[PDB]
């Protein structure tokens, strides 16, 4: 709809009377003026808003009776206007003509015809008038006509350039919001409820990701409400303009003042939340009201004395100091307060606190007679131009100070006062102490710097000056010793065959430095020096192992010598050699990139460009201290948020990009990268966020943990995405590396036993129902079936393998005592062996050993079990009706548990010893010692776990003695009723790793050679049921951990058997790099 509102800006210097002018025509006095409704903002006072947060007409007003001096005073205003809205209309009105002779009128008339109306650099003043007085005038009648017609003309001009007129149509929903924001009654008008207000007005502009940002954008430009977009009080805090302006302006007037006393007053004036108060102070900085000095003080630039304090400097002879001048036509408004804010952090030691003094127009730092610094404004007669003077003592520390000062000045101007980049830079020098200084432009000194000569007096050769004394910042004399270029080491040709690449900065060549391969950036005639120094500022102070460091810089040919990667870009590797890209290598690359991001984010630097092209590899050797680095720190791969082209980049944009990198690493084919070849789908795909399952879609081997990390990372909402610090913490995990698969079982399925086929599937029992039900899991497809095969509940399964006969059978022992034997090659071949006198408690198998609940052990001949109703070879009575057999272990002598005794068998099945273990109660606790044995692990000692024990007993089988106890509670006691500490199962690996499962979702990794805790693996599931060691169909060894996850959920987790080693190796890797980070940062 045809929006008919436009802002009116009234500006001028203090004393003009322009407020009354407005009243006759009809911080800041804001009010509507229906004529066309103008939103009039009367900047009667010094409301920095015109620079601190800069469809409007600029009415400039000045007092004619003051004259031409005032006209010149308006140049900074005109500059600022052009600098933010060069296309905007400007009407210049002089006033108080009734007390100003026409001499002044025509003097000022000629003044503006000579210096403003036809002068570039000013925003082409559209018209002008002279007014007798604010009482009314024919001139004002004409002015009213001028303003109306010209504002119409302006919008016509916008249509010619922008494409919008004074009835330009804007989405009506935005118009509605304006009205909704108008209707707001809040005591402390800081708004967050806006989300609700959207919901109050039905739900308009529902594209929160696009329309909402546009509405907000409009609302600031239209002068309705204020976002403050890195402040905390920014996005969710829309504040009424009247309060922003009023309160901050008043507090200024309510010069060093302690923060706390300001807080005291403020708390009485307006009871802001202390959180808001911290932001309040940050806003005072942002809006140039007050600058932070120490953490307890504010400078308050405005109102500082403007009578440069008497300063006596040490050093007097010309050669003792260095002087630099900046010639300007006028200082921009706010130039000084911004400059001061930057200069306050200067320090010659950053590679005692200084006696600081403030002039408003200058800063004096003292430090020491050895090194001090004075920056301030000075003006000479017959030279209308104003200008800066910088003075430092001529020595290395003085140089360092100078470098920091001029870098801040140039950066200030590039960001805030472009257009000037005027700024005639002069250096002062003399050929003899006691004489006057001579001026020279730095450009000419640069011409001489290229020669490398001494400055020579053209009339007298005897008089020369080393350039460094005049301009030690043209020659890079302020570099750290560590990066000064040694010209006897650097070896390069600048020949075509060494060209590695180029850019707007010049070119890059391959070279040698101190015997190493390096890259040399050359600033080959591209506004050099300034670009060079900008790069030097960024490169220094960033010293992380994952970044490309600077290996010395040198002004003689203007070079940056940097580390050259030996294996090249990740991109190439992804499309060059998947064999190098092992699972181990991939993980390490992810860590190194994550560190770089964490570091740069803590350094307040947004990378904005992660991709395989920017990742460099320095060795493909998986176990190296440093493998990947991020290039050039300081396309179709964009976050969907920033892809809109209407928001601001931040760490969350980088995180999103990182997630995509990880996705690209996961699928080593670079399949989404291949998608780039069809960019119309590729860029949109990323925008949609609808990425395909990396496993299913590309045929990529499963990698859980990472898979969910990517999903967690790539969220639509920036506020829901993980921080880069968190991303790293997640990547920092042995579990991440070694977890390979996780299969959930169907809801309410309880498996009490497992048999993996050593040849890729698992036979599962089922204790959920009370019926003999046998299930089956296909690891190749995660397929699952199940059928009832017996009456009573299946207790134990065993695999009979007869490779000689080319067949195999599953033996199912159950509660009834029967043995159901089923051919694995033929489901129809089912038969039952001689029924046992009691239930089957365990199976082992060659002989099929059947341990029953009455302590009886049946031994069946290897092949005999094929026949239905077959009897065992022999039967032993080991225990009794109350002492069931529960474990037959063997690692050709058998060992096992019967009640509280440990038995052992010969190859003739004879008892070789009955070890009563109950006697261990002299140690530990009798209710733990006196309990049925659950499992026996046979190594160089026996490891016994008993039912409901928290302690594992270690026995010396050679002497039958207790040799130690393992307290599981203790280990988890160190870890900060899920902590039952009950031992569930024991598994043993011959590399000394001992795997102990427990009641809660924890797995302890112990070191058999020292009996020490390697690591606690936890938050696995609700409870661990069984653990198996099994070789997969790809010959990999893994742990099969079956657990409960009560909603009776249960699941199978597959771990890479080398977990114990990965835990230790990863830890080492990280610590080494941690030390290197400190090494680098400390050198500086």
Residue with tokens 């009485």: 268
Q: How many residues does the chain have?
A: 1084
Cα–Cα distance, 707 to 664 (Å, whole number) = 12
Q: How far is 979 from 748, CA to CA, in rounded Å?
A: 24
Q: For residues 1024 and 1003, give the distance between their C-alpha atoms in angstroms, rounded to a whole number.
A: 8
CA dist 193 and 1059 (Å) reads 50
Q: Which long-range contacts (CB under 8 A, 24 or more apart) does 775-781 make?
A: 775/749, 775/751, 777/743, 777/1052, 779/741, 779/743, 779/1032, 779/1033, 780/1033
Closest C-alpha to 864, from 885, 881, 847: 847
Geometric angle at alpha carbon 971, from 969 and 972, rounded to 5°: 65
Q: Is-contact 30 40, C-beta < 8 A?
A: yes
Nearest to 967 by CA among 1009, 916, 922, 1004: 1004
- Which residues contribute to the annotated binding site for GTP? 12-19, 697-720, 880-883
The two three-digit tokens of residue 851, written as one number: 């341990």
Angle, CA 913 vertex, CA 907 and CA 914 arms, to 5°: 130
Instruction: Confirm if 266 and 251 have CB atoms less than 8 A apart.
Output: yes
Structure tokens at 133: 């007085």
Q: Residue 600 and residue 653: Cα distance in Å, rounded?
A: 13
Give the integer Cα–Cα distance in Å for 788 and 1065. 47
Question: How far is it, in rounded angstroms, from Cα 1044 to Cα 984?
Answer: 12
- Indicate the helix (H) or strand (E) that contains 1081: helix 1059-1083
The DSSP element (H or E) to which 497 belongs, if any, is none
As given in the structure block, the two tokens for residue 663 are 């996705």
Spatial distance between the Cα atoms of 163 and 314, rounded to a whole number of angstroms:
61
Q: What is the 3-state secondary structure (H, E, C) of 76-118?
A: HHHHHHHHHHCCCCEEEEEECHHHCCHHHHHHHHHHHHHHCCC
Buried b (16+ CB within 10 A) or exposed e, 544-553: bbbbbbbbbb
Angle, nearest 10°, between helix axes 274-286 and 259-269?
Answer: 120
- Distance between CA atoms of residues 800 and 333, nearest Å: 91
Structure tokens at 1081: 């940062």
Neighbour-count burial for 85-108, b at 16+ CB within 10 Å, e otherwise: beebbbbbbbbbbeebeeebbeeb
In CATH terms, the fold of domain 742-1067 is Methylamine Dehydrogenase; Chain H (2.130.10)
C-alpha to C-alpha distance for 623 and 697, rounded to whole angstroms: 31
| Chain centre distance of CA 239 | 29
Q: Where are the beta strands (DSSP E) in 234-349?
A: 238-239, 257-258, 297-298, 321-328
Which residue in 600, 638, 641, 633 sits closest to 615, CA to CA?
A: 633
DSSP-assigned letter for residue 883: B
CA distances from 839 to 156, 596, 753, 925 (A): 97, 61, 15, 31
Phi, psi of 225 (to 5 degrees): -150, 170
Give CA–CA dist 1024/1042, Å, rounded.
6
Question: What are the start-end ranges of the H helices in 417-525?
Answer: 442-451, 467-470
Cβ(784)–Cβ(778) below 8 Å:
yes
> Distance (Å, rounded) from C-alpha 376 to C-alpha 391?
9
Q: How is residue 779 annotated by DSSP?
A: T
Q: Give start and end residues of each alpha helix (H) in 434-564.
A: 442-451, 467-470, 530-539
Largest CA distance in the chain: 134
Determine which helix (DSSP H) or strand (DSSP E) holds 152, and give its type and residue range. Answer: helix 138-161
Give 919's DSSP letter.
Answer: G
| Residue 834 CB coordination number (10 Å) | 16
Q: Kindly state the DSSP code that residue 162 receives in the 8-state scheme.
A: T
Helix extents (H) in 545-611: 570-574, 583-602
3-class DSSP assignment, residue 422: coil
Say if residues 777 and 768 touch (Cβ distance below 8 Å). no
Per-residue H/E/C for 967-983 = EHHHHHHHCCCCCCCCE
DSSP letter (8 states) at residue 880: B
Taking each helix axis from N to C terminus, what angle separates 274-286 and 241-253, rounded to the nearest 10 degrees?
80
* β strands within 143-192, DSSP E: 190-191
| 138 CB-near residues (< 8 Å, 6+ apart) | none
Q: Quick check: helix, strand or coil at residue 259?
A: helix
Secondary-structure class of domain 482-564 per CATH:
alpha beta
> What is the distance between the alpha carbons of residues 650 and 600, in angstroms, rounded to a whole number?
12
* C-beta separation of 775 from 765 below 8 A: yes
Contact 1041, 1024 (CB under 8 A): yes
> Which CATH superfamily is 569-741 part of?
Transferase(Phosphotransferase) domain 1 (1.10.510.10)
Residues tagged in the binding site annotation:
12-19, 500, 502-503, 506, 508, 519, 521, 562-563, 565, 569, 572, 613, 616, 631-632, 697-720, 880-883
CA 607 to chain centre: 9
What H or E segment, with its residue span, contains residue 286?
A: helix 274-286
User: In this structure, are residues 570 and 583 in contact, taking their beta carbons and an 8 Å threshold?
Assistant: no
Per DSSP, the chain holds a count of helices (H) and strands (E) of 28, 55
Tokens at residue 253, please?
């007037």
On the 0-12 / 13-18 / 19+ scale of CB atoms within 10 A, 346 is buried
User: Parallel, antiparallel, or unpaired for β 568-569 and 357-358?
Assistant: unpaired
Phi (first) and psi of residue 934, to 5 degrees: -90, -50
Q: Are 92 and 111 in contact (CB under 8 A)?
A: no
Q: With H, G, I as helix, E, B as strand and everything else as coil, classify residue 542.
A: coil
DSSP string, 370-415: TEEEEEEEE--TT--SEEEEEEEESSHHHHHHHHHHHHHHHHHHHH
First-to-last alpha carbon distance for the chain, in angstroms, is 60
3-class SS at 761? strand
Detail the DSSP E strand segments found in 854-930: 856-861, 874-877, 885-889, 894-898, 901-905, 915-916
Half-sphere exposure of 583 (CA within 13 A, CB side): 14
Which residue among the candidates 235, 609, 838, 930 is catalytic per the annotation?
A: 609
The 3-state DSSP class for residue 338 equals helix
Please name the helix (run of DSSP H) or strand (run of DSSP E) that holds residue 1063, with its range, or none: helix 1059-1083
Q: How many CB atoms lie within 10 A of CB 941?
A: 16
Q: What is the DSSP letter of 498?
A: G
Residue 471 neighbours by CB under 8 Å, 6+ apart: 427, 442, 445, 449
- Where is the binding site for ATP, in residues? 500, 502-503, 506, 508, 519, 521, 562-563, 565, 569, 572, 613, 616, 631-632
For this PDB entry, the determination method is cryo-EM
Rg of the chain in Å (alpha carbons): 41
- Dihedral of the CA atoms 369, 375, 378, 384 (nearest 10)? 150
> How many whole angstroms separate alpha carbon 412 and alpha carbon 335?
9
Backbone angles phi, psi at 1023, to 5 degrees: -155, 145
Residues near 101 by Cβ (< 8 Å), separated by ≥ 6? none
- 784: Cβ–Cβ under 8 A, 6 or more apart, which residues? 745, 746, 775, 776, 777, 778
In the residue annotation, 609 being an active-site residue is answered as yes
Closest by alpha carbon to 620, among 585, 574, 570? 585
Look at residue 644 and give its three-state secondary structure: helix
- Tokens standing for residue 691: 């990425």
Rounded to an integer, what distance in angstroms lies between the CA atom of residue 12 and that of residue 28? 12
Give, in degrees to the nearest 5, the angle at Cα 767 between 766 and 768. 95
DSSP SS3 for 476? coil
């Amino acid at each position: 709809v045809p929006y008919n509102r436009m802002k009116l800006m009234i500006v001028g210097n203090t004393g003009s009377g322009k407020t009354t002018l407005l009243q006759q025509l009809m911080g800041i006095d804001v009010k509507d003026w229906p004529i066309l409704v103008l939103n009039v903002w009367d900047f009667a006072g010094r409301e920095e808003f015109y620079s601190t947060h800069p469809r409007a007409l600029y009415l400039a007003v000045y007092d004619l009776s003051k004259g031409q001096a005032e006209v010149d005073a308006m140049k900074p205003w005109l500059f600022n206007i052009k600098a933010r809205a060069s296309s905007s209309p400007v009407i210049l009105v002089g006033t108080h003509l009734d007390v100003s002779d026409e001499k002044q009128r025509k003097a000022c008339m000629s003044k503006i015809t000579k210096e403003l109306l036809n002068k570039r650099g000013f925003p082409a003043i559209r018209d002008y008038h002279f007014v007798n007085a604010t009482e009314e005038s024919d001139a004002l009648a004409k002015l009213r006509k001028t303003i109306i017609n010209e504002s119409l003309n302006f919008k016509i001009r916008d249509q010619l350039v922008v494409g919008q007129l004074i009835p330009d149509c804007y989405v009506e929903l935005e118009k509605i919001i304006l009205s909704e924001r108008k209707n707001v009654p809040i005591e402390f008008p800081v708004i967050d409820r806006k989300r609700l207000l959207q919901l109050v007005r039905e739900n308009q502009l529902q594209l929160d990701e696009n329309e909402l940002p546009h509405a907000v954008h409009f609302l600031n430009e239209s002068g309705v409400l204020l976002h403050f977009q890195a402040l905390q009080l920014s996005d969710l805090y829309f504040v009424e303009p009247k309060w922003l302006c009023k309160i901050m302006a008043q507090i200024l007037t309510v010069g060093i003042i302690s923060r706390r006393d300001v807080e005291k007053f403020l708390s009485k004036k307006r009871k802001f939340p202390k959180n808001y108060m911290s932001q309040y102070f940050k806003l005072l900085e942002k809006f140039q009201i007050a600058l932070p000095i120490g953490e307890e003080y504010l400078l308050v630039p405005s109102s500082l004395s403007d009578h440069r304090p008497v300063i006596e400097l040490p050093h007097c002879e010309n050669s003792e100091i260095i002087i630099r001048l900046y010639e300007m036509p006028y200082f921009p408004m706010g130039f000084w307060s911004r400059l001061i804010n930057r200069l306050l952090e200067i320090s010659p030691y950053m590679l005692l606190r200084p006696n600081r003094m403030y002039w408003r127009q200058g800063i004096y730092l003292n430090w020491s007679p050895e090194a001090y610094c004075l920056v301030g404004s000075e003006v000479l007669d017959n030279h209308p131009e104003s200008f800066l003077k910088i003075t430092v003592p001529s020595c290395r520390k003085g140089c360092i100070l100078l470098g920091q000062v001029v870098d801040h000045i140039d950066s200030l101007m590039e960001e805030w006062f472009p257009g000037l980049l005027l700024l005639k830079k002069w250096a002062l020098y003399s050929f003899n102490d006691g004489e006057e200084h001579q001026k020279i432009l730095l450009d000419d000194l640069m011409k001489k710097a290229e020669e490398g000569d001494l400055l020579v007096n053209p009339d007298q050769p005897r008089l020369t000056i080393p350039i460094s004394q005049i301009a030690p910042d043209l020659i890079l004399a302020d570099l750290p010793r560590n990066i000064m270029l040694n010209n006897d080491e650097l070896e390069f040709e600048q020949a075509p065959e060494f060209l590695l690449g180029d850019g707007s900065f010049g070119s890059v060549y391959r070279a040698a430095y101190e015997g190493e391969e390096v890259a040399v950036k050359i600033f080959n005639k591209h506004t050099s020096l300034r670009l060079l120094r900008q790069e030097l500022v960024v490169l220094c102070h960033l010293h992380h192992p994952s970044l490309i460091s600077l290996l010395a810089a040198g002004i003689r040919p203007r070079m940056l010598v940097m580390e050259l990667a030996s294996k090249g870009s990740l991109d190439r590797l992804l499309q060059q050699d998947k064999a190098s890209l092992t699972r181990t290598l991939q993980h390490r690359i992810a860590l190194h990139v994550a560190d770089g991001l964490r570091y740069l984010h803590s350094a307040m630097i947004i990378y904005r460009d992660l991709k395989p092209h920017n990742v460099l590899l320095f060795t493909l050797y998986p176990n190296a201290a440093i493998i990947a680095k991020i290039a050039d720190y300081g396309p179709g791969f964009r976050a969907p948020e920033v892809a809109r082209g209407n928001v601001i980049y931040n760490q969350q944009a980088d995180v999103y990009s990182f997630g995509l990198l990880l996705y690209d690493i996961l699928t080593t084919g670079g399949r989404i990268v291949e998608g780039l070849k069809f960019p119309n789908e590729f860029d949109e795909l990323e925008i949609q966020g609808k990425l395909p399952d990396p496993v299913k879609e590309y045929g990529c081997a499963p990698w859980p943990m990472v898979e969910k990390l990517i999903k967690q990372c790539l969220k639509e909402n920036p506020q829901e995405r993980p921080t880069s610090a968190q991303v790293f913490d997640i990547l920092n995990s042995a579990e991440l590396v070694c977890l390979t698969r996780r299969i959930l079982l169907p809801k309410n399925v309880i498996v009490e036993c497992m048999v993996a086929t050593h040849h890729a599937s698992i036979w599962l029992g089922c204790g959920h129902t009370d019926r003999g039900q046998l299930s089956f899991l296909d690891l190749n497809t995660e397929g699952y079936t199940s059928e009832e095969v017996a009456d009573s509940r299946i207790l134990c399964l065993a695999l009979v393998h007869l490779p000689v006969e080319k067949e195999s059978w599953i033996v199912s022992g159950t509660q009834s005592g029967t043995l159901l034997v089923i051919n694995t090659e033929d489901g129809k071949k089912r038969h039952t062996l001689e029924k046992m006198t009691d239930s089957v408690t365990c199976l082992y198998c060659n002989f099929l050993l059947v341990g029953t609940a009455d302590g009886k052990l049946a031994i069946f001949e290897d092949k005999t079990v094929k026949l239905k109703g077959a009897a065992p070879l022999k039967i032993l009575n080991i225990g009794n009706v109350s002492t069931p057999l529960m474990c037959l272990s063997e690692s050709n002598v058998m060992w096992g548990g019967c009640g509280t005794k440990i038995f052992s068998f010969s190859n003739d099945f004879t008892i070789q010893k009955l070890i009563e273990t109950r006697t261990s109660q002299l140690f530990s606790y009798a209710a733990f010692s006196d309990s049925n044995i659950i499992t026996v692990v046979v190594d160089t000692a026996l490891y016994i776990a008993k039912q409901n024990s928290p302690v594992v007993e270690v026995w010396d089988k050679k002497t039958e003695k207790l040799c130690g106890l393992i307290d599981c509670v203790h280990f988890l006691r160190e870890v900060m009723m899920s902590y039952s500490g009950r031992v569930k199962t024991l598994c043993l690996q011959k590399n000394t790793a001992l795997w102990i499962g427990t009641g809660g979702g924890h797995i302890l990794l112990l070191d058999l050679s020292t009996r020490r805790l390697i690591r606690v693996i936890y938050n696995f599931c609700n409870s661990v049921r069984v653990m198996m060691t099994a070789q997969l169909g790809s010959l990999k060894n893994v742990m099969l951990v079956l657990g409960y996850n009560r909603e009776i959920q249960s699941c199978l987790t597959v771990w890479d058997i080398n977990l114990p080693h990965e835990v230790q190796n990863l830890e080492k890797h990280i610590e080494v790099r941690k030390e290197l980070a400190e090494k680098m940062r400390r050198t500086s």
